[PDB]
Amino acid sequence: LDPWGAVEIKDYDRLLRTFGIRPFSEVLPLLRKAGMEPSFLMRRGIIFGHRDFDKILEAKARGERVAVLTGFMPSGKFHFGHKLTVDQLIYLQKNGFKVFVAIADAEAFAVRRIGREEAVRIAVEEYIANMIALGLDPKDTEFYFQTNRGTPYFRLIQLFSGKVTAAEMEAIYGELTPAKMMASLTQAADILHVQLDEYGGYRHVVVPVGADQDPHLRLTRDLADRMAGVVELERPASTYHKLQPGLDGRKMSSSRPDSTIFLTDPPEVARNKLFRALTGGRATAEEQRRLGGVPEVCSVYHMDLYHLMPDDGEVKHIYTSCRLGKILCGECKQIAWEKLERFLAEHQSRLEKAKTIAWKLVEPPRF
Amino acid sequence: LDPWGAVEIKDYDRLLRTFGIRPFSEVLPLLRKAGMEPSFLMRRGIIFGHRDFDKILEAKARGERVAVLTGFMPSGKFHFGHKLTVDQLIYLQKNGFKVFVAIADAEAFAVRRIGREEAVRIAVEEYIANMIALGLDPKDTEFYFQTNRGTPYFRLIQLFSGKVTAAEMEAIYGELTPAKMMASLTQAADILHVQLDEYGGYRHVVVPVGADQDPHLRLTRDLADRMAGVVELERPASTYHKLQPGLDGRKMSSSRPDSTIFLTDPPEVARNKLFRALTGGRATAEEQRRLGGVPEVCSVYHMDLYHLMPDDGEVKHIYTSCRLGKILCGECKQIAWEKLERFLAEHQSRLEKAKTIAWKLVEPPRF
Numbered sequence: 187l188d189p190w191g192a193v194e195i196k197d198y199d200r201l202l203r204t205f206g207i208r209p210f211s212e213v214l215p216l217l218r219k220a221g222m223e224p225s226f227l228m229r230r231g232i233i234f235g236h237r238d239f240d241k242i243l244e245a246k247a248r249g250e251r252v253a254v255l256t257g258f259m260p261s262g263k264f265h266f267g268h269k270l271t272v273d274q275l276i277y278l279q280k281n282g283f284k285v286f287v288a289i290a291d292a293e294a295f296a297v298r299r300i301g302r303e304e305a306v307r308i309a310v311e312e313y314i315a316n317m318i319a320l321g322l323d324p325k326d327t328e329f330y331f332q333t334n335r336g337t338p339y340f341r342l343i344q345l346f347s348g349k350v351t352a353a354e355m356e357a358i359y360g361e362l363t364p365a366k367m368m369a370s371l372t373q374a375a376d377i378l379h380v381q382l383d384e385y386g387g388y389r390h391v392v393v394p395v396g397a398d399q400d401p402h403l404r405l406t407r408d409l410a411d412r413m414a415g416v417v418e419l420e421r422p423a424s425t426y427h428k429l430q431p432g433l434d435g436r437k438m439s440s441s442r443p444d445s446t447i448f449l450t451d452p453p454e455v456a457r458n459k460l461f462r463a464l465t466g467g468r469a470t471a472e473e474q475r476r477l478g479g480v481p482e483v484c485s486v487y488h489m490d491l492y493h494l495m496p497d498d499g500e501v502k503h504i505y506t507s508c509r510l511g512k513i514l515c516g517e518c519k520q521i522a523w524e525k526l527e528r529f530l531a532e533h534q535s536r537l538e539k540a541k542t543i544a545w546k547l548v549e550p551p552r553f
Numbered sequence: 554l555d556p557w558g559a560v561e562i563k564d565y566d567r568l569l570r571t572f573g574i575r576p577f578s579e580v581l582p583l584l585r586k587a588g589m590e591p592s593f594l595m596r597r598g599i600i601f602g603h604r605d606f607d608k609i610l611e612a613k614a615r616g617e618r619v620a621v622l623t624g625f626m627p628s629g630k631f632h633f634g635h636k637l638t639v640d641q642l643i644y645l646q647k648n649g650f651k652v653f654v655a656i657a658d659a660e661a662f663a664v665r666r667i668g669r670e671e672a673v674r675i676a677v678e679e680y681i682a683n684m685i686a687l688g689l690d691p692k693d694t695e696f697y698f699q700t701n702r703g704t705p706y707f708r709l710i711q712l713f714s715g716k717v718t719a720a721e722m723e724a725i726y727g728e729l730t731p732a733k734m735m736a737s738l739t740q741a742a743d744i745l746h747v748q749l750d751e752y753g754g755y756r757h758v759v760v761p762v763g764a765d766q767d768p769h770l771r772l773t774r775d776l777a778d779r780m781a782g783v784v785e786l787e788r789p790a791s792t793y794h795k796l797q798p799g800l801d802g803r804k805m806s807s808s809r810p811d812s813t814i815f816l817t818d819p820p821e822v823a824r825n826k827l828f829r830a831l832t833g834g835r836a837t838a839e840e841q842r843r844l845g846g847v848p849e850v851c852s853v854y855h856m857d858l859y860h861l862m863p864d865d866g867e868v869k870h871i872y873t874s875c876r877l878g879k880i881l882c883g884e885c886k887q888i889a890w891e892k893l894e895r896f897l898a899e900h901q902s903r904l905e906k907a908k909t910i911a912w913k914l915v916e917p918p919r920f
């Protein structure tokens with residue numbers, strides 16, 4: 187009975203310590219003092235790492251307003267990969283964090299070749315509207331476009347350009363276009379700019395990411411340090427989540443629709459995707475009942491663990507049964523489906539109103 | 554009697570035609586129709602080339618407000634190299650052109666490592682104050698800082714990053730840092746942004762440069778073309794001036810003080826620099842009187858031609874005498890000095906008031 191899977195953690199949690207990334211449990215006593223109980227993603231070890239989130243919670247504890255920031259590429263549809271990020275935002279927002287969400291429409295245009303009108307449409311109706319329907323507060327959340335964020339944010343990007351080398355950027359990105367160079371600096375500015383007085387002066391900011399995104403964060407932290415004497419910036423903190431494996435064994439992508447469920451999928455499309463998902467199940471009903479299934483490798487069990495079963499007892503019960511022989515994939519799938527069906531229907535019923543609201547939460551760029 | 558020196562023109566004027574650069578004389582009939590008489594720099598062939606300045610003058614002729622734009626690196630002192638640019642601005646401004654001057658303080662910081670406070674000080678007291686004392690109108694001239702120019706200008710730079718390759722930039726600049734990549738895009742935006750409605754909508758803009766600056770202009774023109782469908786931009790026009798050779802035979806630079814006269818040089822410093830200048834004169838007073846001097850190679854004669862003698866008769870008289878044997882360098886130098894002395898004293902007496910005014914012509918960036 188290891189339902190949370192500490193085993194696969196410990197392995198790289200050794201190597202990430204090299205980058206100053208720590209086990210998330212080291213912040214529990216601070217979470218408590220900050221008046222916060224861990225979210226289920228934290229209890230389950232899905233949020234496994236942090237860097238400097240202690241410093242964030244210390245500020246918060248003494249009454250400082252703290253912030254969380256992330257951004258989204260407005261391309262393709264909003265999926266459960268995206269949902270995992272937003273749920274961390276919602277948890278922090280309910281605990282008093284100021285939330286910033288950047289729309290990466292400059293990067294969309296310049297790196298991904300996405301048209302202006304479409305980037306803006308997708309951002310508002312597919313990203314912001316889904317985040318609102320998920321529960322991000324339309325009034326206190328500050329959404330913005332990279333291309334419409336104002337002089338002091340843009341100044342950072344200009345000044346950061348003097349404080350990084352081609353080689354440092356080549357390390358992070360590989361072979362490096364002007365667009366990618368520009369994207370990299372703008373993203374550091376997305377993270378750091380909220381510390382400027384013109385955007386609220388939030389010195390203490392945490393960014394929720396996957397380990398695979400740390401190199402850009404370390405660059406952003408170096409930029410903050412290298413700006414000493416020009417503008418005073420604190421190194422941003424972070425939390426680290428394991429990435430949810432896709433329904434087809436590979437990473438969730440709008441690119442391959444069967445990898446993931448889109449939050450706008452009609453019930454029949456979603457069910458079919460779910461019933462097609464890879465499992466840790468066996469050759470036949472019969473072999474399953476003798477040995478059991480393998481949840482550690484099962485994408486249905488991961489849907490349960492990351493989204494569909496917030497109750498620890500329910501998901502443990504699924505883990506145990508699967509292993510103990512007591513359950514077949516077909517039934518397991520139908521159980522996850524019924525959680526999914528209800529979440530989708532409540533979600534989609536909020537979505538048309540969220541779209542109306544979304545267009546009023548931002549000023550889209552003129553061109 | 555070739556005092557204007559067409560000879561050295563024709564040579565490369567062949568090769569620059571490859572880039573679509575034309576002899577400046579092809580625009581005379583348009584200059585006339587636009588209600589403008591050529592400036593002495595134009596009469597003397599010092600402005601030798603143009604690209605698309607016909608299209609500018611056609612707009613102007615039908616009553617459109619046309620613009621000229623250039624920018625300055627706020628580093629070192631304002632010299633007669635800089636003065637030659639500003640005098641072209643002043644001529645255009647008197648003929649109804651809107652003038653924009655960019656201060657390249659982002660490039661100063663990121664490429665040249667110049668501090669923020671100092672870039673800003675130097676820009677205002679050394680560059681803008683000297684331009685005002687020279688006669689640039691403090692009320693109608695729009696001076697701005699790269700780092701303080703606003704969202705729509707910055708958006709261009711973000712979008713341009715998707716429309717140029719590392720190789721195209723490598724061609725212009727050599728090995729290419731993030732700062733240089735950033736400088737190159739910002740400079741295109743300096744030129745193009747005035748076409749946006751938020752900055753006055755000046756579609757028709759001419760940039761006065763030396764031939765050696767054309768590659769960046771061709772890139773800026775390509776960027777305008779490549780933005781079709783995103784923002785409608787006209788290819789900027791240009792005029793081309795020969796560079797004034799330095800007093801020490803080499804190019805004018807704040808780097809080597811004896812190369813040039815600074816507009817703030819006290820009369821004794823300036824005279825000494827002038828009396829030290831390289832000439833086309835001879836071994837001794839005696840050999841000079843037989844053969845003559847060589848004005849084509851003489852940096853005193855070039856001071857006369859570019860600044861000190863706006864009257865064509867006076868400078869021709871210097872050319873002829875020098876050649877005909879009638880004048881020695883010592884006397885020639887003292888004649889140029891007396892023009893210089895008077896120009897400096899009138900100029901410096903306007904400079905303290907221009908400094909006061911200058912601080913009110915711009916909003917310096919916060920950091």
Ligand code: SF4
Binds near residue numbers: 479485487514519
């Ligand atoms: S019974 Fe459920 S947890 Fe076990 S392998 Fe099948 S789908 Fe996965």
Ligand code: SF4
Binds near residue numbers: 847854875882
């Ligand atoms: S006489 Fe004048 S123009 Fe002739 S070489 Fe001497 S300084 Fe130059």
